[PDB]
Amino acid sequence: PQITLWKRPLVTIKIGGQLKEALLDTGADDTVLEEMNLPGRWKPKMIGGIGGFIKVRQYDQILIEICGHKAIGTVLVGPTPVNIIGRNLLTQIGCTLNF
């Protein structure tokens, strides 16, 4: 589909057996999801933006479906105020900016 930017580019995603709303975010290097109890091993990480850093747990090779498009990659989990789909997964679903 084509998504205009009048409103936040929120779409439904499926991860770890749960449906959620997430931002298609071209300004996010990595994918950062709101606190959730994923199984498996993880590594601690810090990611910074406006206002400073948050501590997140890094899970690798996590499957996510974004608008029916499947993707698999690194997912960071932590106290983010919104679910953010970053470039590492946006590339995998064939997402581009166009103007």
Q: Which is nearer to a copy of itself, 40 or 52 (CB)?
A: 52
Please report whether residue 49 would count as binding ligand XUY according to CB under 6 A: yes
Contact 33, 80 (CB under 8 A): yes
Which residues ranging from 18 to 47 are in contact with ligand XUY (CB under 6 A)? 23, 25, 27-30, 32, 47
In whole angstroms, give the CA distance from residue 65 to residue 87: 15
Tell me how far apart the alpha carbons of residues 8 and 75 are, in angstroms, rounded to a whole number.
21
Which residues of this protein are in contact with a copy of itself, per CB under 8 A?
A: 1-6, 8-9, 23-29, 32, 47-54, 67, 69, 80-82, 84, 87, 90-91, 93-99
